[PDB]
Structures are given as C-alpha cells and as structure tokens.
Design a protein around this ligand. Sequence first.
Ligand SMILES: C[C@@H](O)[C@@H](C(=O)O)[C@@H]1NC(C(=O)O)=C([C@H]2CCCO2)S1
Length: 268
Amino acid sequence: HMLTNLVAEPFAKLEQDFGGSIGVYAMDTGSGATVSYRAEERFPLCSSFKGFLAAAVLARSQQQAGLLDTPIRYGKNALVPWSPISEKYLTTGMTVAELSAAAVQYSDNAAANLLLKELGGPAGLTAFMRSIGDTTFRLDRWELELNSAIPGDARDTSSPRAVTESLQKLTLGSALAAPQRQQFVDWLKGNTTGNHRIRAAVPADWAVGDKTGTCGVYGTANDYAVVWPTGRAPIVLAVYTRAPNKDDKHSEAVIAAAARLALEGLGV
Ligand SMILES: C[C@@H](O)[C@@H](C(=O)O)[C@@H]1NC(C(=O)O)=C([C@H]2CCCO2)S1
C-alpha cells in the first residue's frame, strides 16, 4: 500500500479539480508493484468494452478456424451513429477481423454490434470475461444504449482493477493463444482514438496499445493500455472517470494527468 499512499493526495487534488471521480489502477509487471485510487469502484465501460469484445472474438477463433476471415454482410439498418469504417463497406461487407479492428481502432459502433451478435450478445461477452477470471465486468446493453452512464447504475460497468487485470491476462498472460495474443496487441497498438489520453502521458519511444471509451454524458470517459518502456517490462494501467451531472464534460487532459501520476507512483 506504500506506492498507493505516495500519490493519494495528488490523485485527490486531480479529481477535485476535475469535479468528479477518477479511478486508476496501474501494475508494473516486472516488479509487481501496483498503484490504486478508487480502483475497485465501478465506472461505466462506454466504448472501452470493444477491446474486450475483440479479444473474445479472437478466443472464439481458436476453436472456429476461419472465423476471422468470414465475410459479414449487413444492411443500412445495421448502421449505428459513429460507424466510420463499416459505413464505407455497406455495399460490400467486411470480414470478422476487419470488424474487430474497426471496433478497436475507430470505436466503430455498427461493427461492435455485429460482433456482439456473433458472440451471443452482452451476456456472451460477459461470459467470456468470466472465463478468464474476471468477476467484476458486466455488459448488459448494446450500442448506443450502453453509454447512459447513469449515476449508481451498475449496468455496463467494471472497475479499473478488473480492467487492468483482464487486460494483462489477454495481452501478456495466457488467456489467449500466442498468435491471437499478438493480434490483440497489434490491434490495440493501431488504435487511432487515444492520442490525447494515456499515449500523451508516456515517452515518445515507448510502445503503446490502448482502447478508449467516451460515453458523452456525466463526464464519463476512460482509457486502458499496455505500455512498453524501451528494454524493460511492460506496465498495464486503466484510467476511468465519471462526474455527478449529465451535462458535465469529460476531460482527456485529466486522463493523461492521472496516467502520469500512476507512472510516477510506480517509479517511472
Ligand atoms: C458513441 C460515440 O460517441 C463513442 C463510441 O462509439 O463509443 C465514440 N468512441 C469514443 C472513444 O473514446 O473510443 C469517441 C472518440 C472516437 C473517435 C473520436 O472520439 S466517440
């Protein structure tokens, strides 16, 4: 608990200035050191579930060979607001792997709902998370309803600690087979939506894979990431925020600042 106490006061000041709640968990995978602040509280997942969704698809592909290259055709009624990739392939279809990359790297909502259907819905994704030992994660709704971020509502939430623990298992641990694990890392490394969050907190030479979430209400936004300091063991971390009023705005700068404090607490 020593490293957590080191940054406890700076985290409290950061969330006071933000006007809401910040939850952070960070793990140095070399030393095992951790930093926690509200790490066991529930926060809305928002779009960040899409990373775990892609991992669940990769897990299924270990059993169903050829799943990733399966073509998926869809109609205009499958389009959801903010579907920047899948709308460009409406007239052609996309493969499961392309939908997964679009969900991870562009937060594509039509792709996410199509993949949720392939997994058996929100309960199917929740079941995958249970299968890797995550008892906290719950997905309950589809896009876009899952973004309501209602104060006190446990639907479509997890905790920063559970997010970090699951991310570690999937990117660095044994929850996925080696080829699928590297594909998951590669998709996260290619994310385009996180340049102002955890990525803004790390040195330019560090490799980073991340997935963001932005609910659009209640100051609710987040980011989780695996980061590789050059020549050293990776760090896994999650930063989640929420705020009391529906009209409260989220802040990418606060997410980046919290990531910096977590890394400073860990000693890097
Ligand atoms: C409902 C949507 O507003 C939201 C979502 O699909 O979940 C988008 N995703 C996120 C994210 O943080 O992943 C925002 C980013 C993505 C691209 C620029 O804003 S908006």
